[PDB]
Protein backbone atom coordinates (compact mmCIF):
# COMPACT_ATOMS: atom_id res chain seq x y z
CA UNK A 1 0.00 0.00 0.00
CA UNK A 2 1.52 3.25 -1.17
CA UNK A 3 -0.06 6.12 0.73
CA UNK A 4 -1.73 8.00 -2.15
CA UNK A 5 -0.44 11.52 -2.78
CA UNK A 6 -0.45 14.07 -5.59
CA UNK A 7 2.37 12.18 -7.34
CA UNK A 8 0.47 8.91 -7.63
CA UNK A 9 -2.83 10.79 -7.93
CA UNK A 10 -2.40 14.31 -9.30
CA UNK A 11 -6.19 14.60 -9.58
CA UNK A 12 -6.27 15.06 -5.75
CA UNK A 13 -3.97 17.97 -4.77
CA UNK A 14 -5.41 18.01 -1.26
CA UNK A 15 -3.45 14.78 -0.68
CA UNK A 16 -0.38 17.00 -0.62
CA UNK A 17 0.76 17.37 2.99
CA UNK A 18 0.16 20.66 4.80
CA UNK A 19 2.69 19.73 7.47
CA UNK A 20 4.88 16.74 8.31
CA UNK A 21 7.07 15.95 11.28
CA UNK A 22 9.70 13.24 11.20
CA UNK A 23 10.19 11.94 14.75
CA UNK A 24 13.08 9.97 16.29
CA UNK A 25 12.19 7.06 18.55
CA UNK A 26 15.15 5.62 20.42
CA UNK A 27 13.65 3.00 22.77
CA UNK A 28 15.01 -1.90 24.98
CA UNK A 29 14.57 -1.99 21.20
CA UNK A 30 15.69 -0.66 17.80
CA UNK A 31 15.37 2.94 16.60
CA UNK A 32 12.34 3.73 14.44
CA UNK A 33 10.97 6.84 12.76
CA UNK A 34 7.53 8.22 13.57
CA UNK A 35 5.74 10.31 10.99
CA UNK A 36 2.95 12.81 11.68
CA UNK A 37 1.12 14.01 8.57
CA UNK A 38 -1.43 16.85 8.63
CA UNK A 39 -3.68 17.47 5.64
CA UNK A 40 -5.28 20.68 4.49
CA UNK A 41 -9.07 20.68 4.04
CA UNK A 42 -9.98 17.69 1.89
CA UNK A 43 -12.72 17.76 -0.73
CA UNK A 44 -15.31 14.94 -0.74
CA UNK A 45 -13.72 12.93 -3.57
CA UNK A 46 -10.14 13.01 -2.30
CA UNK A 47 -11.36 12.29 1.24
CA UNK A 48 -13.43 9.39 -0.09
CA UNK A 49 -10.36 8.10 -1.93
CA UNK A 50 -8.01 8.22 1.06
CA UNK A 51 -10.70 6.71 3.27
CA UNK A 52 -11.11 3.69 1.01
CA UNK A 53 -7.36 3.20 0.65
CA UNK A 54 -6.91 3.15 4.42
CA UNK A 55 -9.82 0.70 4.64
CA UNK A 56 -8.16 -1.59 2.10
CA UNK A 57 -5.02 -1.15 4.21
CA UNK A 58 -6.98 -2.20 7.29
CA UNK A 59 -8.48 -5.40 5.93
CA UNK A 60 -5.34 -6.70 4.17
CA UNK A 61 -2.96 -6.10 7.08
CA UNK A 62 -0.39 -4.55 4.75
CA UNK A 63 2.18 -1.83 5.40
CA UNK A 64 1.76 1.74 4.20
CA UNK A 65 4.59 3.15 2.09
CA UNK A 66 5.03 6.93 2.43
CA UNK A 67 7.01 9.51 0.45
CA UNK A 68 7.95 12.73 2.25
CA UNK A 69 8.31 15.35 -0.52
CA UNK A 70 10.20 17.66 1.87
CA UNK A 71 13.12 15.23 1.58
CA UNK A 72 13.13 15.13 -2.22
CA UNK A 73 16.44 16.99 -2.15
CA UNK A 74 17.78 15.77 -5.48
CA UNK A 75 21.20 16.94 -4.22
CA UNK A 76 22.57 13.65 -5.53
CA UNK A 77 21.75 12.53 -9.06
CA UNK A 78 22.88 9.89 -11.50
CA UNK A 79 22.97 6.14 -12.09
CA UNK A 80 22.65 4.61 -8.62
CA UNK A 81 22.53 1.12 -10.13
CA UNK A 82 26.16 1.38 -11.21
CA UNK A 83 27.23 2.30 -7.68
CA UNK A 84 29.08 -0.37 -5.71
CA UNK A 85 28.49 -0.95 -2.02
CA UNK A 86 31.12 -3.37 -0.69
CA UNK A 87 29.92 -6.36 1.38
CA UNK A 88 30.45 -6.91 5.10
CA UNK A 89 29.78 -3.38 6.27
CA UNK A 90 28.09 -2.55 9.55
CA UNK A 91 27.97 0.21 12.13
CA UNK A 92 27.41 3.91 11.52
CA UNK A 93 29.44 4.43 8.33
CA UNK A 94 28.61 3.29 4.84
CA UNK A 95 31.31 3.38 2.19
CA UNK A 96 30.47 3.16 -1.48
CA UNK A 97 32.20 3.47 -4.84
CA UNK A 98 30.37 5.84 -7.19
CA UNK A 99 32.26 4.56 -10.21
CA UNK A 100 31.94 8.16 -11.40
CA UNK A 101 28.22 7.81 -12.12
CA UNK A 102 26.93 10.18 -9.43
CA UNK A 103 26.73 13.98 -9.53
CA UNK A 104 26.49 16.31 -6.53
CA UNK A 105 26.81 15.29 -2.88
CA UNK A 106 24.48 14.70 0.06
CA UNK A 107 24.49 16.77 3.24
CA UNK A 108 23.84 16.15 6.92
CA UNK A 109 20.11 15.98 7.44
CA UNK A 110 19.33 14.20 4.17
CA UNK A 111 17.64 10.80 4.10
CA UNK A 112 19.32 7.60 2.98
CA UNK A 113 18.10 4.09 2.28
CA UNK A 114 19.58 0.81 1.04
CA UNK A 115 17.77 -0.58 -2.02
CA UNK A 116 17.36 -4.08 -0.59
CA UNK A 117 16.10 -3.18 2.90
CA UNK A 118 13.20 -1.02 4.10
CA UNK A 119 15.01 0.83 6.94
CA UNK A 120 15.40 4.59 6.42
CA UNK A 121 18.41 6.47 7.76
CA UNK A 122 19.39 10.07 8.39
CA UNK A 123 22.76 11.15 6.96
CA UNK A 124 24.74 12.72 9.80
CA UNK A 125 28.05 13.49 8.04
CA UNK A 126 29.68 13.02 4.64
CA UNK A 127 33.18 13.02 3.22
CA UNK A 128 34.66 11.83 -0.05
CA UNK A 129 37.97 10.83 -1.57
CA UNK A 130 37.55 10.76 -5.32
CA UNK A 131 34.85 8.19 -6.09
CA UNK A 132 34.92 6.93 -2.51
CA UNK A 133 31.97 8.24 -0.51
CA UNK A 134 31.90 7.95 3.24
CA UNK A 135 28.33 8.43 4.47
CA UNK A 136 27.78 8.56 8.22
CA UNK A 137 24.30 7.34 9.25
CA UNK A 138 21.76 7.34 12.07
CA UNK A 139 20.79 4.90 13.34
CA UNK A 140 23.43 2.20 12.79
CA UNK A 141 22.88 -0.14 9.83
CA UNK A 142 20.19 -2.73 10.52
CA UNK A 143 21.90 -5.29 8.30
CA UNK A 144 25.43 -6.24 7.27
CA UNK A 145 25.86 -5.34 3.59
CA UNK A 146 25.84 -8.19 1.06
CA UNK A 147 27.54 -6.34 -1.79
CA UNK A 148 24.36 -6.05 -3.85
CA UNK A 149 22.86 -3.02 -2.10
CA UNK A 150 22.43 0.20 -4.06
CA UNK A 151 22.15 3.63 -2.39
CA UNK A 152 18.87 5.54 -2.48
CA UNK A 153 18.87 9.33 -1.97
CA UNK A 154 15.60 10.34 -3.63
CA UNK A 155 12.13 8.82 -3.78
CA UNK A 156 12.66 7.13 -0.44
CA UNK A 157 9.57 5.42 0.96
CA UNK A 158 9.19 4.75 4.67
CA UNK A 159 7.49 1.42 5.35
CA UNK A 160 5.03 2.15 8.12
CA UNK A 161 1.97 1.21 10.19
CA UNK A 162 -0.92 3.54 10.93
CA UNK A 163 -1.13 4.45 14.63
CA UNK A 164 -4.34 6.49 14.64
CA UNK A 165 -6.95 4.56 12.68
CA UNK A 166 -9.31 4.99 15.64
CA UNK A 167 -9.31 8.77 15.34
CA UNK A 168 -9.26 8.96 11.59
CA UNK A 169 -12.06 10.71 9.82
CA UNK A 170 -14.05 13.88 9.72
CA UNK A 171 -17.51 14.99 8.86
CA UNK A 172 -18.55 17.43 6.16
CA UNK A 173 -18.11 21.03 7.26
CA UNK A 174 -20.00 24.14 6.20
CA UNK A 175 -17.96 24.72 3.03
CA UNK A 176 -18.38 21.13 1.89
CA UNK A 177 -14.94 19.84 2.88
CA UNK A 178 -13.34 17.72 5.62
CA UNK A 179 -11.04 19.37 8.16
CA UNK A 180 -8.46 18.14 10.65
CA UNK A 181 -7.41 14.97 8.91
CA UNK A 182 -4.02 13.79 10.13
CA UNK A 183 -2.11 10.53 9.93
CA UNK A 184 0.29 9.18 12.55
CA UNK A 185 2.64 6.54 11.22
CA UNK A 186 5.28 4.35 12.82
CA UNK A 187 8.11 2.80 10.84
CA UNK A 188 7.63 -0.97 11.14
CA UNK A 189 10.62 -3.15 11.95
CA UNK A 190 8.99 -6.09 10.12
From Swiss-Prot:
Transmembrane intervals: none
RNA-binding found in the keyword field: no
Domain of life: Viruses
Predominant cellular place of this UniProt entry's protein: virion
Pfam families: DTP-pb9_A-dom_C, DTP-pb9_A-dom_N, DTP-pb9_B-dom
Gene3D superfamilies associated with the record: 2.40.30.290, 3.30.200.190
GO cellular component: virus tail; virus tail, baseplate
Keyword list, A-Z: Late protein, Viral tail protein, Virion
Alphabetized InterPro entries for the sequence: DTP-pb9_A-dom_C (IPR048416), DTP-pb9_A-dom_N (IPR048417), DTP-pb9_B-dom (IPR048415)
Subcellular location: Virion
Keyword set includes Transcription: no
The protein's role, per its UniProt record: Forms the simplified baseplate, together with the p132 collar protein, the baseplate tube protein p140 and baseplate hub protein pb3.
Quaternary structure annotation from Swiss-Prot or TrEMBL: Homohexamer. Interacts with baseplate tube protein p140 and baseplate hub protein pb3.
Record comment regarding domains: Possesses OB-fold domains probably serving host adhesion properties.
Protein name: Distal tail protein pb9
Annotated gene: D16
Amino acid sequence: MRLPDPYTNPEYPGLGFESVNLVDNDPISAQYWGINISYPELFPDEYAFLDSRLLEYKRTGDYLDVLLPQYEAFRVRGDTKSVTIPAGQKGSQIILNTNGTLTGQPKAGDLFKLSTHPKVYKITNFSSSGNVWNISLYPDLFITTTGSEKPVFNGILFRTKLMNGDSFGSTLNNNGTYSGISLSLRESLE
